[PDB]
Amino acid sequence: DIVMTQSHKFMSTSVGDRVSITCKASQDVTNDVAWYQQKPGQSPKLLIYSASYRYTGVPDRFTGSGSGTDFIFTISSVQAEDLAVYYCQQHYSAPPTFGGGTKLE
Amino acid sequence: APKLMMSAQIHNNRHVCDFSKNNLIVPESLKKKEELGGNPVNIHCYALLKPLDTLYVKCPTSKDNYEAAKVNISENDNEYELQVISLIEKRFHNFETLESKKPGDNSTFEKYFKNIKIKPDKFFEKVINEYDDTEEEKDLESILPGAIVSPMKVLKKKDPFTSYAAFVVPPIVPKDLHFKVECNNTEYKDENQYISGYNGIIHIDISNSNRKINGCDFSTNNSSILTSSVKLVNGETKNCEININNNEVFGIICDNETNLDPEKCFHEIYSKDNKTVKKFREVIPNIDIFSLHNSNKKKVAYAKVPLDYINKLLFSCSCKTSHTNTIGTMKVTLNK
Amino acid sequence: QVQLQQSGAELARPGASVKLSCKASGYTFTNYWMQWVKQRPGQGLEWFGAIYPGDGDTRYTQKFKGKATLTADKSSSTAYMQLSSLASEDSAVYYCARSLYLGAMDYWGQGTSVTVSS
């Protein structure tokens, strides 16, 4: 199975800052990566699909980039409600696999 | 014979077949005896077309279209194309009684095939006549004027390994008409060379039912297609009305200056009363309809109604110009 | 209008079995994957397995193949996940999630909590 590594379990940022979260695939997955946001007590929400496309209704401050093995999720200007755990996931090869998540504080 | 098959027939107007994939990666009982690469196989699929029916051909999806499917999957298809999918979703893998006998990474598969390389783009608009060695990919229309033809498109974006294309044969053929299309790919296997290629092919014939038909040509009185016409081409609305029956053939022909309204006639029809476009399935869903919503051109449509057809409808189809301020048309009273 | 409604919380004794449900509405059930995602208390997301009800194909992460069974009822647009021989490691929230086959999970259920305890 493909391993998705989010090397940072935790990430701190101020309201109004830019922040980037990294996710590395153990093999090439092309653009078959999704990013999810999970806030306490809630189901995960899809934010980015196919590595760099904003999902329907996702605010403009959220973006993603990358192709191959190195992927980046970015918040251009963090808002106070953006604290959550962010997860990457690959679906290039079955079974889909999740990164370990990064908690934004 | 070679590995010959006829396309499957559905209703009285649909023909369909496909090509297989991943067949040169054989088991050791064969592979250990092999060296220096894999080769294509002698597989053929045949179509026999009559006026106004539709031929569907399915091929392994090119890597470009595969990658596109992975984002296009988020979009929906219209009902007609979904119905088409149910016509053509069948895969053809007839192993007969495969009883104790030898048989006869999703983008990695696409890459593994070194990017599947089948006939590209408007698979059936640019078509090869079997007339001569040039094999020129001619406009379908220059052989079959008024023909309706799709771009090539993915079968199920959620099963993005198969793509397909289709076209509708008009009433007029240049006598003994033959076309062909083909679908190639590559692969490799457990040998000392690690290369391999594969191919599939379709031969398209016609039956002895071609003739001029009804339909009120909007380009010329000296129609090469129709037994009826409408005075003048443009600048003012002109029209026809016709009493036709099942087992008769009729249609609508726009000029280069005009286009069909209904956009997908005949799948849609114009209701004279209340001035509105409806489906050719509103009261008669159990129906052979001789057209294609995703066609490359929306200027010409006709219908060949068989004797076993059970339907009846009073409706119209029209042609409108770039000014839009016209209803130039023919009223179709089918089985009136 | 796409909705996934999951069943209520379960308390189960070790060694017993439980069957969770995920009722889908608002889309063509047989054009999509229904998958399950496991989240143990305080931990990350684990992709569990999926069924494609259109053809019945199932796919499991290897570690979960032994004890879990995924099924679907096309007539009611409902997916089921059955956990057997429950152990403390099975205590978790299980989410169902819609995706195109092998794709991004766009709609999620609210989750069902399973607690394994004597």
Spatial CA neighbour of A10 closest among A85, A90, A97, A93: A85
Q: Assess C25–B contact: CB distance below 8 Å, yes or no.
A: no
C32 CB neighbours in chain B (<8 A) are: 158
3-state secondary structure of A82: helix
| Dist. CA B135–CA B40, nearest whole Å | 21
Q: Assess A31–B contact: CB distance below 8 Å, yes or no.
A: yes
With tokens 């031929």, the residue in question is: B55
Answer whether A87 sits within 8 Å of C44, measured CB to CB.
yes
Residues 6+ apart with CB under 8 A from B45: B4, B5, B6, B7, B17, B18, B19, B57, B200, B201, B202, B203
The residue range of the domain holding A37 is: 4-104
The tokens describing B55, both together, are 């031929």
C101 CB neighbours in chain B (<8 A) are: 158-159
| Dist. CA A99–CA A36, nearest whole Å | 10
Looking at the complex, report in whole angstroms how far the Cα of residue A90 sits from the nearest Cα belonging to chain B. 12
B106 CB neighbours in chain C (<8 A) are: 102
| Dist. CA B328–CA B320, nearest whole Å | 6
C31 CB neighbours in chain B (<8 A) are: 158
Q: How far is CA A52 from CA A47, A68, B85, in A?
A: 10, 12, 30
Q: Report the CATH number that the domain containing residue A42 is assigned in CATH.
A: 2.60.40.10
Helices then strands, counting H and E runs in chain A, come out as 0, 11
Question: Do residues B303 and B212 touch, judged by C-beta distance below 8 A?
Answer: no
A31 CB neighbours in chain B (<8 A) are: 67, 70
Give me Rg for the CA atoms of chain B: 22
| Dist. CA B262–CA B319, nearest whole Å | 8
Domain count for chain A, please give it.
Answer: 1
Q: Assess B192–A contact: CB distance below 8 Å, yes or no.
A: no
A56 CB neighbours in chain C (<8 A) are: 106
Q: Indicate which of B66, B106, B159 best probes the interface with A, i.e. most A CBs within 10 Å of its own CB.
A: B106
With tokens 């006869």, the residue in question is: B104
Report how this structure was experimentally obtained: cryo-EM
Spatial CA neighbour of C79 closest among C10, C29, C12, C113: C29
C-contacting residues in B 92-131 (Cβ below 8 Å): 106
β-pair type (B276-279, B268-271): antiparallel
| Dist. CA B299–CA B149, nearest whole Å | 11
With tokens 């996702």, the residue in question is: A58
Looking at the complex, report in whole angstroms how far the Cα of residue A87 sits from the nearest Cα belonging to chain B. 20
| A100 phi-psi bin (left φ>0, alpha ψ -120 to 50, beta other) | alpha
Q: Assess A32–B contact: CB distance below 8 Å, yes or no.
A: yes
C106 CB neighbours in chain A (<8 A) are: 46, 49, 55-56
Domains, chain C, ordered by start: 15-111 (2.60.40.10)
A53 CB neighbours in chain B (<8 A) are: 71
3-state secondary structure of B67: helix
Q: How far is CA B91 from CA B42, B59, B85, B155, C89, in A?
A: 18, 11, 12, 11, 43
3-state secondary structure of C96: strand
Pairs of residues, one from chain B and one from chain C, whose beta carbons lie less than 8 Å apart: 13
**Which residues on adjacent β-strands are paired with residue B317?**
B330
Looking at the complex, report in whole angstroms how far the Cα of residue A84 sits from the nearest Cα belonging to chain B. 26
Answer whether A89 sits within 8 Å of C47, measured CB to CB.
yes
- The minimal CB distance from A53 to the residues B67, B71, B106 is found for B71
Answer whether C101 sits within 8 Å of B106, measured CB to CB.
no
| Dist. CA B50–CA B206, nearest whole Å | 6
The tokens describing B308, both together, are 């076993």
C neighbours by CB contacts (3+ pairs under 8 Å)? A, B
Q: What is the resolution of this structure in A?
A: 4.3
**Which residues on adjacent β-strands are paired with residue C82?**
C19, C69
Q: Minimal Cα distance from A2: which residue of B?
A: B105
Q: Assess B74–A contact: CB distance below 8 Å, yes or no.
A: yes
Answer whether C44 sits within 8 Å of A95, measured CB to CB.
no
Q: Assess A92–B contact: CB distance below 8 Å, yes or no.
A: yes
With tokens 């009285």, the residue in question is: B12
Looking at the complex, report in whole angstroms how far the Cα of residue A29 sits from the nearest Cα belonging to chain B. 8
| Dist. CA A91–CA A97, nearest whole Å | 7
| Dist. CA B140–CA C80, nearest whole Å | 51
Domains, chain B, ordered by start: 3-206 (no CATH), 239-334 (2.60.40.2860)
Provide DSSP, B275-298: TEEEETTSS--S------TT-S--
| Dist. CA C108–CA C79, nearest whole Å | 13
CA angle B314, B319, B321 (to 5 degrees): 155
- The minimal CB distance from C106 to the residues A46, A85, A99 is found for A46
C103 CB neighbours in chain A (<8 A) are: 34, 49, 91
User: Roughly how many angstroms between the first and final C-alpha of chain A, as a whole number?
Assistant: 30
Q: In A31-75, where does DSSP find H-type helix?
A: none
A28-67 CB burial, b ≥16 within 10 A, e <16: ebbbbbbbbbbeeeebbbbbbbbbbbbbeebeeebbbebe
Q: Assess A50–B contact: CB distance below 8 Å, yes or no.
A: yes
**Number of residues assigned to chain C:** 118
